[PDB]
Design an enzyme around this catalytic site. Structure first.
Site, PDB file in Angstrom:
ATOM      1  N   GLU A 104     -49.404  13.494 -23.911  1.00  0.00           N
ATOM      2  CA  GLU A 104     -50.266  14.446 -23.214  1.00  0.00           C
ATOM      3  C   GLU A 104     -51.548  14.505 -23.953  1.00  0.00           C
ATOM      4  OE1 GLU A 104     -48.464  18.198 -21.992  1.00  0.00           O
ATOM      5  OE2 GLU A 104     -46.800  17.463 -23.238  1.00  0.00           O
ATOM      6  N   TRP A 168     -41.388  15.950 -26.552  1.00  0.00           N
ATOM      7  CA  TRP A 168     -40.791  17.001 -25.672  1.00  0.00           C
ATOM      8  C   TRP A 168     -41.751  17.126 -24.473  1.00  0.00           C
ATOM      9  CZ3 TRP A 168     -39.711  22.777 -27.740  1.00  0.00           C
ATOM     10  CH2 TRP A 168     -39.069  23.516 -26.751  1.00  0.00           C
ATOM     11  N   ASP A 170     -43.506  18.133 -20.968  1.00  0.00           N
ATOM     12  CA  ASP A 170     -43.868  19.399 -20.389  1.00  0.00           C
ATOM     13  C   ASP A 170     -42.873  19.749 -19.301  1.00  0.00           C
ATOM     14  OD1 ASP A 170     -46.986  20.658 -18.991  1.00  0.00           O
ATOM     15  OD2 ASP A 170     -45.076  21.690 -19.480  1.00  0.00           O
ATOM     16  N   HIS A 216     -47.795  26.460 -30.204  1.00  0.00           N
ATOM     17  CA  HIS A 216     -48.361  26.150 -28.891  1.00  0.00           C
ATOM     18  C   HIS A 216     -47.975  24.781 -28.366  1.00  0.00           C
ATOM     19  CE1 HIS A 216     -51.601  23.220 -29.889  1.00  0.00           C
ATOM     20  NE2 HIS A 216     -51.844  23.951 -30.959  1.00  0.00           N
ATOM     21  N   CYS A 217     -47.852  24.699 -27.053  1.00  0.00           N
ATOM     22  CA  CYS A 217     -47.589  23.427 -26.438  1.00  0.00           C
ATOM     23  C   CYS A 217     -48.926  23.158 -25.759  1.00  0.00           C
ATOM     24  CB  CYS A 217     -46.417  23.519 -25.496  1.00  0.00           C
ATOM     25  SG  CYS A 217     -46.373  25.083 -24.597  1.00  0.00           S
ATOM     26  N   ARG A 223     -42.527  25.615 -23.493  1.00  0.00           N
ATOM     27  CA  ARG A 223     -41.916  25.006 -24.641  1.00  0.00           C
ATOM     28  C   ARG A 223     -42.154  25.965 -25.812  1.00  0.00           C
ATOM     29  NH1 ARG A 223     -44.944  19.334 -23.927  1.00  0.00           N
ATOM     30  NH2 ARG A 223     -46.425  20.853 -23.091  1.00  0.00           N
ATOM     31  N   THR A 224     -43.364  26.547 -25.904  1.00  0.00           N
ATOM     32  CA  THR A 224     -43.720  27.544 -26.922  1.00  0.00           C
ATOM     33  C   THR A 224     -42.735  28.748 -26.893  1.00  0.00           C
ATOM     34  OG1 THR A 224     -46.164  27.132 -26.975  1.00  0.00           O
ATOM     35  CG2 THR A 224     -45.417  29.248 -27.565  1.00  0.00           C
TER      36      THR A 224
HETATM   37  O1  VO4 Z   1     -47.535  23.685 -22.369  1.00  0.00           O
HETATM   38  V1  VO4 Z   1     -46.012  24.438 -22.191  1.00  0.00           V
HETATM   39  O2  VO4 Z   1     -45.327  24.346 -20.381  1.00  0.00           O
HETATM   40  O3  VO4 Z   1     -44.355  24.192 -22.141  1.00  0.00           O
HETATM   41  O4  VO4 Z   1     -46.392  25.989 -21.976  1.00  0.00           O
END
Ligand code: VO4
Length: 282
Positions: A104, A168, A170, A216-217, A223-224
């Site tokens: 990503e 991991w 999204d 943070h993701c 995920r966060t």
């Molecule tokens: O960037 V995350 O969908 O898992 O919040």
């Protein structure tokens, strides 16, 4: 069963009512609004609860569930980078856990700068990255570890350890096993850095707005939140905190999307069930 379908059904109508109720309204006074033209939110609909905001120009929140204190935030935008690094250093960040995949980050359309694996200069600040280790957490998931040295003239130099889970995807839930394995790696990393500060006599160790893990993701809500939920569950002090309170607190302190997919919820329910922890209030 306390974890039966009926019960998971009750759990959902509740959290769902709460998600609908917290959806941002145009110029919602419950949420931080961007200013002067600069963009604040990465996703116009994933906003930042004003009350618990860390900074005015970041989309990021101070979260506390039971006794667990953390800072959940969005993958910073290129413009938010100097402040993002300031938030890191003055918080004396014990551990930065980044849950956004390398693909990503690599996709230049997503506008996710590689702020932690490469050195740089952001305004007055100067960052230096150093890769240290690679831990396998299970199911083929890896975590690469770096150390970010943050420097700005006239300020005291701060090092921050990063745990980056590079694979991991999204919108998915890694398993309960990989999940608790990661919660542990994050606590241990935080506990080791905190101790370095403690052995040094820093005042930051007394202040409860400092020394919190930053996590943070991409959006900072799925995920966060699966990870925030697991950190809460391995804090012994959080006994008898139901899945309802845990999730309600994340939502009221950041936004209504916290625990984005129903499967990420499912992992949170599995860990609970395994601790004999309660799903529903009352
Ligand atoms: O960037 V995350 O969908 O898992 O919040």
């Amino acid at each position: 069963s306390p974890y039966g379908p009926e019960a998971r059904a009750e759990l959902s109508s509740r959290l769902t009512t709460l998600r609908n109720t917290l959806a941002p309204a145009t110029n919602d006074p419950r949420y931080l609004q961007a200013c002067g033209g600069e963009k604040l939110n990465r996703f116009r609909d994933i906003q930042c609860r004003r009350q618990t905001a860390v900074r005015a120009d970041l989309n990021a929140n101070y979260i506390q569930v039971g006794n667990t204190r953390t800072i959940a935030c969005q993958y910073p935008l290129q413009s938010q980078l100097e402040s993002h690094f300031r938030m890191l250093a003055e918080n004396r960040t014990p551990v930065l856990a980044v849950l956004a995949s390398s693909s990503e980050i690599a996709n230049q359309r997503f506008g996710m700068p590689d702020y932690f694996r490469q050195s740089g200069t952001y305004g007055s600040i100067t960052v230096e990255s150093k890769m240290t280790q690679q831990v396998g957490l299970g199911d083929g998931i890896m975590a690469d570890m770096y150390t970010l040295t943050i420097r700005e003239a006239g300020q005291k130099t701060i090092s921050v350890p990063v745990v980056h889970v590079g694979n991991w995807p999204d919108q998915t839930a890694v398993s309960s096993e990989v999940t608790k394995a990661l919660a542990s790696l994050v606590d241990q990393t935080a506990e080791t850095k905190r101790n370095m500060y403690e052995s040094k006599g820093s005042s930051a160790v007394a202040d409860d707005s400092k020394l919190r893990p930053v996590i943070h993701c991409r959006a900072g809500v799925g995920r966060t939140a699966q990870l925030i939920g697991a950190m809460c569950m391995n804090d012994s002090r959080n006994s008898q905190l139901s899945v309802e309170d845990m999730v309600s607190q994340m939502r009221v302190q950041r936004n209504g999307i916290m625990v984005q997919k129903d499967e990420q919820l499912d992992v949170l329910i599995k860990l609970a069930e395994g601790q004999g922890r309660p799903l529903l209030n009352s």
